[PDB]
A paper describes a structure:
[name] is an orphan class A G-protein-coupled receptor that is highly expressed in the striatum and regulates diverse brain and behavioral functions. [name] is able to modulate GABAergic and glutamatergic signaling and the activity of several other GPCRs such as dopamine receptors and opioid receptors. Transcriptional profiling and knockout-mouse studies have shown that [name] plays important roles in regulating diverse brain and behavioral functions, such as cognition, mood, reward-based learning, and motor control. Here we present cryo-EM structures of the human [name]-[name] signaling complex with or without a synthetic agonist (1R, 2R)-2-PCCA.
We then assembled the [name]-[name] complex with [name] (a Gi-stabilizing antibody) in the presence or absence of 2-PCCA, and obtained the cryo-EM density maps of the two complexes at a global nominal resolution of 2.4 Å and 3.0 Å, respectively. The overall structures of [name] with or without 2-PCCA are similar, with RMSD of 0.587 Å. The complex structures of [name]-[name] with or without 2-PCCA show almost the same G-protein coupling interface, with slightly upward shift of the G-protein in the 2-PCCA-bound structure. Interestingly, we observed an electron density in the canonical extracellular orthosteric site in both maps, which may confer the high-basal activity of [name]. However, a clear ligand density still exists in the orthosteric pocket of the apo-[name]-Gi cryo-EM map, obtained as a control. The comparison of two maps suggested that a putative endogenous ligand in the orthosteric pocket may be co-purified with [name] and present in both our structures. The unassigned extracellular density located in a pocket created mainly by TM3, TM4, TM5, and TM7, as well as part of the ECL2. As this position is generally recognized as the orthosteric binding site in class A GPCRs, we suspected that this density represents an endogenous ligand of [name] that was co-purified with the receptor. Electrostatic potential surface of the pocket shows that TM3, TM4, and TM5 create a long hydrophobic pore, while the extracellular surface is mainly charged and hydrophilic. Based on the shape of the density and the feature of the pocket, we suppose that the ligand is a lipid molecule with its non-polar tail inserts into the hydrophobic pore while the polar head group lies in the extracellular surface. Moreover, the shape of the unassigned density and the property of the orthosteric pocket suggest that [name] is likely a receptor in response to certain bioactive lipids.
Residue numbers in the entry:
A (entry chain G): 8 to 63
B (entry chain S): 1 to 121, 124 to 235
C (entry chain B): 4 to 340
D (entry chain A): 4 to 53, 182 to 233, 241 to 354
E (entry chain R): 34 to 88, 113 to 180, 190 to 227, 280 to 351
């Protein structure tokens, strides 16, 4: 189990080595992506039956 | 090893009877609908009969209706054609063709080797104006086919098929539904066109490409072939 | 040696404090002003009536017309969704299937279950019949998920706490990912297919690198088993569905949780999770026999898809986002729009 | 409106549907049994008398049985136990000699209580097998039946002890109106086990057909 | 006695409509036996909505149609249960295909129309005795079918040694009580013998009561039907 403990310590060290950014920036990025691709979402904004492949 | 071997042809007196066989091997025979295609000694191809998978559906050409009969024996892996009251207009070579139908399939993909038979002495029209054209290797050529009725259907599919028949050989499928290349066909061949106007493009032509090119329609029975455009030199 | 355990616990406190210091404002405050989606009403456009037992998996083709469904009656069926026709029907050697996949190129499908074998089927052959190409063995526990990388690579998730990357041509485990503590139940490939995530029964999810085979990050927060996972369309976030009637949204760059999608009257676990094309709608299948549609940016339920008589076991959305297909424990698939 | 190729595709779909219906009808007339046990309690010998999941097929009196043994499926039980919902019956094996050996009828009792009162198996009958008659009979004259059950008061005899253990096992079910429990002592090795399983399965099938008709 | 008729008609039409609606709604939970049950319920609906609300003939032919279809549905459902509980699984599956079930359902109405048309409507006159023979044959068939089921069930319990059997006894007792007066009256009235007025009305009233109460007798023990009722309510 000593090898398991050493491997776990190394894994948490490598996880601690990661860099992190603010939550606000990531939230703004998600919102910006959604706003930029809202126009291309048939489920969000229904399309007319003329070009709906599933009629029925 | 997907070969089809036909047998039973020969010289027969007019008004007689004869049957032809098509022994399949190397594929699941029961899953394929099978056709019979006829070629006169010095003319173009002509469709004869068709039997579906499970023998549910059978069709005949108006020239042979009532005289010919098509049947299959799935356990024995054999295809039959019973012919009665033969005339002098029936002298020709008969080919055995397989075709499977589902979404994205490639019908008419494999043709048999053919058997010869000699007898002692509304339909959509496809036109191939250019009977022959001289071609030099290394260049590009274009073949044109025309339809009297629009082959484009409401679901978007344009049912046009292109076949190539090399000298002394059975025809080979090149392009199905006007845009898709068959398996094993080089990318040099290209197919394009609109309703009632189609074109076949060959780029960087070389040897083993000489032959006669036929255009066929699969929109509705009976299936009709073109006159045939021939290449040489 | 308890010193190593103490050092691990100290590192855990350090990373928890580091990711707490990065929480400046919540996502709810950021999206407090955007206009709500409203009400989403979907009507079942098609119904598929082929199977005779419970359906456990389904996967959409890349061309958004053909889909494959696996059920415990021992058959794989490939449907043409536009016209309801059946293209293929593949009988399985073992009827205890739990997962299914469709190759991006459309030439192959995969299958697996309680027999610890992933089977590859070749759809486009000259003989005209579907044949078994390879049988991948090596997992000790049941297959939970499998996803194609290309025609020659596949990643599989197993109940023996490990995930593996295979080479279909040779049939050998190229890489093995071994970090989890409980059964691994789900899997999701990144849109660029360089990373992927897995959900396990230890109530944690991990981020893996296929090229190097090592866990980049670990996300916690759930209180029970995790049954489903799915990447955000951007590739910088993913959503998990657990047995405590809760869906959660995690972000890779911020390295922490963002939303919790729960309601007082929901007390059943989630079986499947998927996103819409734009990433604004989050669809989750429940044990209450009906799927729910969540506003991913506001955590407000926007609709219900109640058309099934039993538990919804699988759920998927087309690549172009036109339709949603849900399979349930009754033998019917419903295609919504 | 349909083209020729569309009609041929529809015909192919119909033929596939016909084949699926035929295989479903063929599969619906086979009896599926799930085999469970605490450990080496006698599953091997009962399988002999007739990777992950193991299937066993045998035919008796023109009736086809499939017996599934999932002893080797070492993982969380609740994540795949619902895959066996709808089996005809559940076969349970209990070691009747495993009381002196080390309170090992308590793990078996806990497993029986867990599987009998499970949510997915509310209406599924359970067949109870009590292996190792001879060994327990030999042991009962040396080791009293008081190590596991102190409240028991009676003569140290094979019949009475077996009846006491049978009564202790049987009443562990809470829903006594939605399922039955059949008990047998499988040590005869004279093809009585197969006959008993066949009789129990026929009774279960009859009591299931008396419900679709509405009679119940 | 006219006051009794209206309430019986209301109850019968309500029960028949409820049963048909329940079968139609929860259709995935209903099988080949509910087919015969719904056939009987539809015939009962016709007879109940026609005969009493009034108070080829104006209505006599239609009433005869409804009665004969219901009484054949009794035989069909009794045979279905007998074959389900007695015969081997393979024989039942082969005998009761969807096409076979549809054919048996249609043949009942075909025979009903045949006997409604090609007979003088009366109930020694020839046609009158033919009703008694058919009803007695139906009684014998139902008794045999519903005693074999109980005998086999009692045998199976001993084979392994809370299946009350109340429904079978109730159904047989109601059927006998409702049907026997009609045959007793018709036999006397078909052999040129006096029948006091007010005796035929009682027999016909009892027969219409049986038509009204068929669905409750058929489905007062079905767990699926009980669940469907409690879910709709």
């Amino acid at each position: 189990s000593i090898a398991q403990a050493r491997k776990l310590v190394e894994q948490l060290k490598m996880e601690a080595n990661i860099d992190r950014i603010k939550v606000s920036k990531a939230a703004a990025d998600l919102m910006a992506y959604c706003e930029a691709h809202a126009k291309e979402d048939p489920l969000l904004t229904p399309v007319p039956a003329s070009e709906n492949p599933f009629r029925e | 090893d997907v070969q089809l071997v036909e047998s039973g042809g020969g010289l027969v007196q007019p008004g007689g009877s004869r049957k032809l066989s098509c022994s399949a091997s190397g594929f699941a025979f029961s899953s394929f609908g099978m056709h019979w295609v006829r070629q006169a000694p010095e003319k173009g191809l002509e469709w004869v009969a068709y039997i579906s998978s499970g023998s549910g559906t059978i069709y005949y050409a108006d020239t042979v209706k009532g005289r010919f009969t098509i049947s299959r024996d799935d356990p024995k892996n054999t295809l039959f054609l019973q012919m009665t009251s033969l005339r002098s207009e029936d002298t020709a070579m008969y080919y055995c063709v397989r075709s499977i139908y589902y979404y994205g399939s490639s019908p008419f993909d494999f043709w048999g080797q053919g058997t010869t038979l000699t007898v002692s002495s509304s339909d959509i029209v496809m036109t191939q104006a250019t009977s022959s054209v001289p071609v030099t290797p290394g260049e590009s050529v274009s073949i044109s086919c025309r339809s009297s009725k629009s082959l484009l259907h409401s679901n978007g599919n344009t049912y046009l098929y292109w076949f190539l028949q090399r000298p002394g050989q059975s025809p080979q499928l090149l392009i199905y539904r006007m845009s898709n290349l068959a398996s094993g066909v080089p990318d040099r061949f290209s197919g394009s066109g609109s309703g009632t106007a189609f074109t076949l493009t060959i780029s960087r032509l070389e040897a083993e490409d000489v032959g006669v090119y036929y255009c066929m329609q699969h929109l509705e029975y009976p299936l009709t072939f073109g006159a045939g455009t021939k290449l040489e030199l | 040696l308890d010193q190593l355990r103490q050092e691990a616990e100290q590192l855990k406190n350090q990373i928890r404090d580091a990711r707490k210091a990065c929480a400046d404002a919540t996502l709810s405050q950021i999206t407090n002003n955007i206009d709500p989606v409203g009400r989403i009403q979907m009507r079942t456009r098609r119904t598929l009536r082929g199977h005779l037992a419970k359906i456990y998996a389904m996967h959409w083709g890349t061309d958004s017309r053909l889909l494959v469904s696996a059920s415990q009656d021992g058959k794989l069926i490939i449907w043409d969704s536009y016209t309801t026709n059946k293209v293929h029907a593949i009988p399985l050697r073992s009827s205890w299937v739990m997962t299914c996949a469709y190759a991006p190129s459309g030439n192959y499908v995969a299958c697996g279950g309680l027999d610890n074998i992933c089977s590859i089927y070749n759809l486009k052959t000259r003989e005209g019949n579907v044949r078994v190409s390879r049988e991948l063995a090596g997992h000790t526990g049941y297959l939970s998920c499998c996803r194609f990388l290309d025609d020659n690579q596949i990643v599989t998730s197993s109940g023996d706490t490990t995930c593996a990357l295979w080479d279909i041509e040779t049939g050998q485990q190229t890489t093995t990912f071994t970090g989890h503590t409980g059964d691994v139940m789900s899997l999701s490939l990144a849109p660029d297919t360089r990373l992927f995530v897995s959900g396990a029964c230890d109530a944690s999810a991990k981020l893996w690198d296929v090229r190097e085979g090592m866990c980049r990050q670990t996300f916690t927060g759930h209180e029970s088993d995790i049954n489903a996972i799915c990447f955000f369309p951007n590739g910088n976030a993913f959503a998990t569905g657990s047995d405590d009637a809760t869906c959660r949204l995690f972000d890779l760059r911020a390295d922490q949780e963002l939303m919790t999608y729960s309601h007082d009257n929901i007390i059943c676990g989630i079986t499947s999770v998927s996103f819409s094309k734009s990433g604004r709608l989050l669809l989750a299948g429940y044990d209450d026999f009906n799927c729910n549609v969540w506003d991913a940016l506001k955590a407000d339920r926007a609709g219900v898809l109640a058309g099934h008589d039993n538990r919804v076991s699988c759920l998927g959305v087309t690549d172009d986002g036109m339709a949603v297909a849900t399979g349930s424990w009754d033998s019917f698939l419903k295609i919504w729009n | 409106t349909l083209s020729a190729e569309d009609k041929a595709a529809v015909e192919r779909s119909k033929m596939i549907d016909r084949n699926l219906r035929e295989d479903g009808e063929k599969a619906a007339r086979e009896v599926k049994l799930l085999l469970l046990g605490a450990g080496e309690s006698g599953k091997s010998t009962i399988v002999k008398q007739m990777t992950g999941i193991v299937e066993t097929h045998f035919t008796f009196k023109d009736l086809h049985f499939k017996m599934f043994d999932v002893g080797g499926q070492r993982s969380e039980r609740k994540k795949w136990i619902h895959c066996f919902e709808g089996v005809t019956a559940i076969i349970f094996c209990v070691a009747l000699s495993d009381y002196d050996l080390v309170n090992r009828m308590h793990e078996s009792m806990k497993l029986f209580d867990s599987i009998c009162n499970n949510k997915w198996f509310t209406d599924t009958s359970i067949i109870l097998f009590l292996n190792k008659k001879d060994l327990f009979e030999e042991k009962i004259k040396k080791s009293p039946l008081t190590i596991c059950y102190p409240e028991y008061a009676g003569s140290n005899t094979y019949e009475e002890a077996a009846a006491y253990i049978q009564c202790q096992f049987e009443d562990l079910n809470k829903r006594k109106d939605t399922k039955e429990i059949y008990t047998h002592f499988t040590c005869a090795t004279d093809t009585k086990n197969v006959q008993f399983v066949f009789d129990a399965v026929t009774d279960v099938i009859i009591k299931n057909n008396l419900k679709d008709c509405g009679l119940f | 006695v006219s006051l009794l008729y209206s309430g019986l008609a209301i109850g019968g039409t309500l029960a028949n409509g409820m049963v048909i609606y329940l079968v139609s709604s929860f259709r995935k939970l209903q099988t080949t036996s509910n087919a015969f049950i719904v056939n009987g319920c539809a015939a009962d609906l016709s007879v109940c909505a026609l005969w009493m609300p009034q108070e080829r003939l104006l209505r006599g032919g239609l009433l005869g149609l409804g009665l004969t279809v219901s009484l054949l549905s009794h035989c069909l459902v009794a045979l279905n249960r007998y074959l389900l509980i007695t015969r081997a699984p393979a024989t039942y599956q082969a005998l009761y295909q969807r096409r076979h079930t549809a054919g048996m359902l249609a043949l009942s109405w075909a025979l009903a129309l045949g006997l409604v048309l090609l007979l003088p409507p009366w109930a020694v006159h020839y046609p009158a005795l033919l009703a008694a023979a058919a009803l007695l044959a139906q009684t014998a068939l139902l008794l045999h079918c519903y005693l074999g089921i109980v005998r086999r069930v009692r045998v199976s319990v001993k084979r392994v040694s809370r299946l009350s059997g109340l429904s079978v006894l109730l159904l047989c007792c109601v059927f006998l009580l409702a049907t026997q007066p009609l045959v007793w009256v018709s036999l006397a009235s078909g052999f040129s013998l006096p029948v006091p007025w007010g005796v035929q009305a009682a027999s016909w009233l009892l027969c219409c009561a049986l038509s009204a109460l068929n669905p409750l007798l058929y489905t007062w023990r079905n767990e699926e039907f009980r669940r469907s009722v409690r879910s709709v309510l």
